[PDB]
Amino acid sequence: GLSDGEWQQVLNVWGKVEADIAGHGQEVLIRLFTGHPETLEKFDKFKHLKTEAEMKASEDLKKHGTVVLTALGGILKKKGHHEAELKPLAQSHATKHKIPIKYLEFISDAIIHVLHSKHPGDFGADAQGAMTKALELFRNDIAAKYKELGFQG
Protein backbone atom coordinates (compact mmCIF):
# COMPACT_ATOMS: atom_id res chain seq x y z
CA GLY A 1 0.00 0.00 0.00
CA LEU A 2 0.93 3.68 0.19
CA SER A 3 1.46 5.61 3.33
CA ASP A 4 -0.64 8.65 4.23
CA GLY A 5 2.13 10.87 3.09
CA GLU A 6 2.45 9.08 -0.22
CA TRP A 7 -1.25 9.39 -0.91
CA GLN A 8 -1.08 13.07 -0.14
CA GLN A 9 1.67 13.44 -2.75
CA VAL A 10 -0.35 11.46 -5.30
CA LEU A 11 -3.38 13.66 -4.82
CA ASN A 12 -1.32 16.85 -4.87
CA VAL A 13 0.09 15.77 -8.25
CA TRP A 14 -3.38 14.90 -9.36
CA GLY A 15 -4.36 18.60 -8.86
CA LYS A 16 -2.08 19.38 -11.76
CA VAL A 17 -3.95 16.97 -13.89
CA GLU A 18 -7.30 18.36 -12.80
CA ALA A 19 -6.46 21.85 -13.90
CA ASP A 20 -6.42 20.61 -17.48
CA ILE A 21 -7.92 17.10 -17.44
CA ALA A 22 -8.69 16.95 -21.16
CA GLY A 23 -5.19 18.17 -22.13
CA HIS A 24 -3.47 15.72 -19.86
CA GLY A 25 -5.70 12.88 -20.99
CA GLN A 26 -5.14 13.72 -24.66
CA GLU A 27 -1.33 13.81 -24.16
CA VAL A 28 -1.36 10.55 -22.21
CA LEU A 29 -3.32 8.81 -24.90
CA ILE A 30 -1.14 10.22 -27.67
CA ARG A 31 1.97 9.06 -25.80
CA LEU A 32 0.42 5.57 -25.46
CA PHE A 33 -0.66 5.33 -29.07
CA THR A 34 2.55 6.63 -30.61
CA GLY A 35 4.84 4.67 -28.34
CA HIS A 36 2.83 1.48 -28.61
CA PRO A 37 0.84 1.38 -31.85
CA GLU A 38 -0.71 -1.97 -30.95
CA THR A 39 -2.71 -0.10 -28.35
CA LEU A 40 -4.38 2.13 -30.92
CA GLU A 41 -5.70 -0.93 -32.77
CA LYS A 42 -7.86 -1.84 -29.82
CA PHE A 43 -9.84 1.42 -30.22
CA ASP A 44 -12.21 1.13 -33.02
CA LYS A 45 -13.06 4.72 -32.71
CA PHE A 46 -9.44 6.00 -32.88
CA LYS A 47 -7.91 3.52 -35.17
CA HIS A 48 -8.66 5.94 -38.10
CA LEU A 49 -5.97 8.25 -36.61
CA LYS A 50 -2.95 7.90 -38.77
CA THR A 51 -0.66 10.73 -37.58
CA GLU A 52 -0.02 12.56 -34.35
CA ALA A 53 -1.37 15.71 -35.95
CA GLU A 54 -4.64 13.97 -36.51
CA MET A 55 -4.56 12.69 -32.96
CA LYS A 56 -3.92 16.17 -31.58
CA ALA A 57 -6.77 17.56 -33.75
CA SER A 58 -9.31 14.95 -32.64
CA GLU A 59 -11.86 16.49 -30.24
CA ASP A 60 -13.29 13.05 -29.54
CA LEU A 61 -9.79 11.90 -28.38
CA LYS A 62 -9.61 14.80 -25.96
CA LYS A 63 -13.12 13.97 -24.71
CA HIS A 64 -12.08 10.39 -24.18
CA GLY A 65 -9.03 11.52 -22.33
CA THR A 66 -11.35 13.23 -19.90
CA VAL A 67 -13.31 10.00 -19.46
CA VAL A 68 -10.18 8.01 -18.79
CA LEU A 69 -8.60 10.38 -16.33
CA THR A 70 -11.84 11.05 -14.53
CA ALA A 71 -12.16 7.33 -13.90
CA LEU A 72 -8.54 7.09 -12.74
CA GLY A 73 -8.83 10.19 -10.57
CA GLY A 74 -11.87 8.88 -8.83
CA ILE A 75 -10.03 5.66 -8.11
CA LEU A 76 -6.96 7.43 -6.77
CA LYS A 77 -9.12 9.53 -4.46
CA LYS A 78 -10.19 6.30 -2.78
CA LYS A 79 -6.58 5.82 -1.59
CA GLY A 80 -6.66 2.08 -2.26
CA HIS A 81 -10.32 1.53 -1.06
CA HIS A 82 -11.32 1.05 -4.65
CA GLU A 83 -12.75 -2.43 -5.09
CA ALA A 84 -16.15 -1.29 -6.32
CA GLU A 85 -14.65 1.17 -8.77
CA LEU A 86 -11.88 -0.95 -9.97
CA LYS A 87 -13.52 -4.40 -10.39
CA PRO A 88 -15.87 -3.34 -13.20
CA LEU A 89 -13.08 -1.42 -14.88
CA ALA A 90 -10.97 -4.58 -14.85
CA GLN A 91 -13.69 -6.77 -16.06
CA SER A 92 -14.76 -4.45 -18.87
CA HIS A 93 -11.23 -4.19 -20.14
CA ALA A 94 -10.53 -7.90 -20.03
CA THR A 95 -13.81 -9.14 -21.45
CA LYS A 96 -15.03 -6.45 -23.79
CA HIS A 97 -12.01 -4.42 -24.75
CA LYS A 98 -9.44 -7.25 -24.76
CA ILE A 99 -6.70 -5.17 -23.25
CA PRO A 100 -3.55 -6.99 -22.18
CA ILE A 101 -2.27 -6.04 -18.69
CA LYS A 102 0.87 -4.92 -20.30
CA TYR A 103 -1.01 -1.98 -21.76
CA LEU A 104 -1.62 -0.72 -18.17
CA GLU A 105 2.15 -0.69 -17.71
CA PHE A 106 2.48 1.32 -20.91
CA ILE A 107 -0.04 3.93 -19.83
CA SER A 108 1.53 4.17 -16.35
CA ASP A 109 4.83 5.03 -17.97
CA ALA A 110 3.02 7.49 -20.26
CA ILE A 111 1.47 9.29 -17.26
CA ILE A 112 4.92 9.72 -15.64
CA HIS A 113 6.32 10.98 -18.95
CA VAL A 114 3.54 13.45 -19.51
CA LEU A 115 3.71 14.78 -15.96
CA HIS A 116 7.43 15.60 -16.45
CA SER A 117 6.78 17.05 -19.87
CA LYS A 118 4.04 19.39 -18.70
CA HIS A 119 5.45 20.19 -15.27
CA PRO A 120 9.26 20.18 -15.71
CA GLY A 121 10.97 20.82 -12.41
CA ASP A 122 7.62 20.57 -10.57
CA PHE A 123 7.35 16.78 -10.34
CA GLY A 124 10.11 15.89 -7.96
CA ALA A 125 11.50 12.58 -6.95
CA ASP A 126 9.21 12.05 -3.97
CA ALA A 127 6.12 12.90 -6.08
CA GLN A 128 7.23 10.59 -8.83
CA GLY A 129 7.81 7.80 -6.34
CA ALA A 130 4.35 8.21 -4.84
CA MET A 131 2.57 8.40 -8.19
CA THR A 132 4.48 5.35 -9.40
CA LYS A 133 3.39 3.39 -6.36
CA ALA A 134 -0.24 4.39 -6.89
CA LEU A 135 -0.14 3.33 -10.54
CA GLU A 136 1.50 0.03 -9.55
CA LEU A 137 -1.25 -0.57 -7.00
CA PHE A 138 -3.87 0.21 -9.67
CA ARG A 139 -2.46 -2.19 -12.19
CA ASN A 140 -1.74 -4.84 -9.58
CA ASP A 141 -5.35 -4.84 -8.43
CA ILE A 142 -6.54 -4.97 -12.04
CA ALA A 143 -4.14 -7.88 -12.67
CA ALA A 144 -5.71 -9.82 -9.78
CA LYS A 145 -9.07 -9.45 -11.48
CA TYR A 146 -7.59 -10.48 -14.83
CA LYS A 147 -6.20 -13.61 -13.17
CA GLU A 148 -9.70 -14.50 -11.88
CA LEU A 149 -10.98 -14.30 -15.46
CA GLY A 150 -8.00 -16.14 -17.00
CA PHE A 151 -7.52 -13.22 -19.13
CA GLN A 152 -4.09 -12.81 -20.77
CA GLY A 153 -4.53 -10.75 -23.93
XYZ file of C-alpha atoms in Angstrom:
153
model
C 0.000 0.000 0.000
C 0.929 3.676 0.187
C 1.460 5.606 3.328
C -0.641 8.647 4.231
C 2.125 10.873 3.092
C 2.453 9.084 -0.221
C -1.251 9.388 -0.914
C -1.075 13.070 -0.141
C 1.671 13.445 -2.752
C -0.351 11.459 -5.299
C -3.382 13.662 -4.823
C -1.324 16.849 -4.872
C 0.095 15.773 -8.249
C -3.381 14.898 -9.363
C -4.356 18.599 -8.856
C -2.080 19.380 -11.764
C -3.954 16.968 -13.885
C -7.296 18.361 -12.801
C -6.460 21.851 -13.903
C -6.425 20.613 -17.479
C -7.923 17.101 -17.437
C -8.686 16.949 -21.162
C -5.193 18.172 -22.129
C -3.471 15.719 -19.862
C -5.698 12.885 -20.993
C -5.144 13.724 -24.657
C -1.329 13.809 -24.157
C -1.361 10.547 -22.206
C -3.318 8.813 -24.899
C -1.137 10.225 -27.668
C 1.968 9.059 -25.802
C 0.415 5.570 -25.456
C -0.659 5.329 -29.068
C 2.553 6.634 -30.611
C 4.842 4.674 -28.340
C 2.826 1.481 -28.612
C 0.845 1.378 -31.853
C -0.712 -1.969 -30.955
C -2.714 -0.096 -28.350
C -4.379 2.126 -30.917
C -5.696 -0.935 -32.772
C -7.864 -1.838 -29.825
C -9.836 1.416 -30.222
C -12.208 1.133 -33.015
C -13.064 4.724 -32.714
C -9.440 5.996 -32.878
C -7.910 3.516 -35.171
C -8.662 5.938 -38.103
C -5.966 8.247 -36.612
C -2.946 7.900 -38.771
C -0.656 10.726 -37.579
C -0.016 12.561 -34.354
C -1.369 15.708 -35.955
C -4.641 13.971 -36.507
C -4.558 12.694 -32.956
C -3.919 16.172 -31.580
C -6.772 17.557 -33.748
C -9.310 14.951 -32.640
C -11.859 16.488 -30.239
C -13.287 13.046 -29.536
C -9.786 11.895 -28.375
C -9.614 14.803 -25.965
C -13.122 13.967 -24.713
C -12.076 10.389 -24.176
C -9.025 11.523 -22.328
C -11.350 13.233 -19.903
C -13.314 10.002 -19.465
C -10.182 8.014 -18.788
C -8.596 10.381 -16.333
C -11.841 11.047 -14.527
C -12.158 7.331 -13.902
C -8.539 7.091 -12.739
C -8.834 10.187 -10.568
C -11.873 8.880 -8.827
C -10.035 5.660 -8.108
C -6.960 7.433 -6.768
C -9.124 9.534 -4.460
C -10.187 6.297 -2.783
C -6.577 5.818 -1.589
C -6.665 2.080 -2.256
C -10.318 1.529 -1.060
C -11.325 1.047 -4.654
C -12.747 -2.431 -5.094
C -16.150 -1.287 -6.317
C -14.651 1.173 -8.768
C -11.881 -0.945 -9.968
C -13.521 -4.397 -10.389
C -15.869 -3.338 -13.195
C -13.082 -1.419 -14.880
C -10.973 -4.578 -14.853
C -13.695 -6.767 -16.064
C -14.755 -4.447 -18.873
C -11.231 -4.189 -20.141
C -10.527 -7.897 -20.033
C -13.814 -9.141 -21.451
C -15.027 -6.446 -23.785
C -12.010 -4.422 -24.746
C -9.442 -7.254 -24.763
C -6.699 -5.165 -23.245
C -3.548 -6.994 -22.177
C -2.270 -6.038 -18.686
C 0.871 -4.920 -20.302
C -1.012 -1.977 -21.755
C -1.618 -0.722 -18.174
C 2.155 -0.685 -17.710
C 2.477 1.316 -20.912
C -0.037 3.929 -19.828
C 1.533 4.166 -16.353
C 4.832 5.031 -17.974
C 3.016 7.485 -20.261
C 1.468 9.294 -17.260
C 4.919 9.715 -15.641
C 6.323 10.977 -18.947
C 3.537 13.449 -19.507
C 3.710 14.781 -15.956
C 7.433 15.600 -16.451
C 6.783 17.053 -19.871
C 4.037 19.394 -18.700
C 5.451 20.192 -15.272
C 9.258 20.177 -15.705
C 10.968 20.822 -12.406
C 7.617 20.575 -10.569
C 7.349 16.779 -10.341
C 10.111 15.888 -7.964
C 11.499 12.582 -6.951
C 9.208 12.051 -3.966
C 6.121 12.905 -6.078
C 7.230 10.586 -8.835
C 7.812 7.804 -6.340
C 4.354 8.206 -4.841
C 2.572 8.397 -8.192
C 4.478 5.350 -9.398
C 3.386 3.392 -6.362
C -0.239 4.393 -6.890
C -0.138 3.334 -10.543
C 1.501 0.032 -9.553
C -1.255 -0.570 -7.000
C -3.866 0.213 -9.671
C -2.460 -2.193 -12.195
C -1.738 -4.841 -9.580
C -5.351 -4.841 -8.427
C -6.544 -4.972 -12.043
C -4.137 -7.878 -12.666
C -5.715 -9.823 -9.780
C -9.066 -9.446 -11.479
C -7.587 -10.475 -14.826
C -6.198 -13.610 -13.174
C -9.705 -14.498 -11.877
C -10.981 -14.299 -15.464
C -8.003 -16.140 -16.996
C -7.522 -13.216 -19.133
C -4.089 -12.815 -20.766
C -4.531 -10.754 -23.931
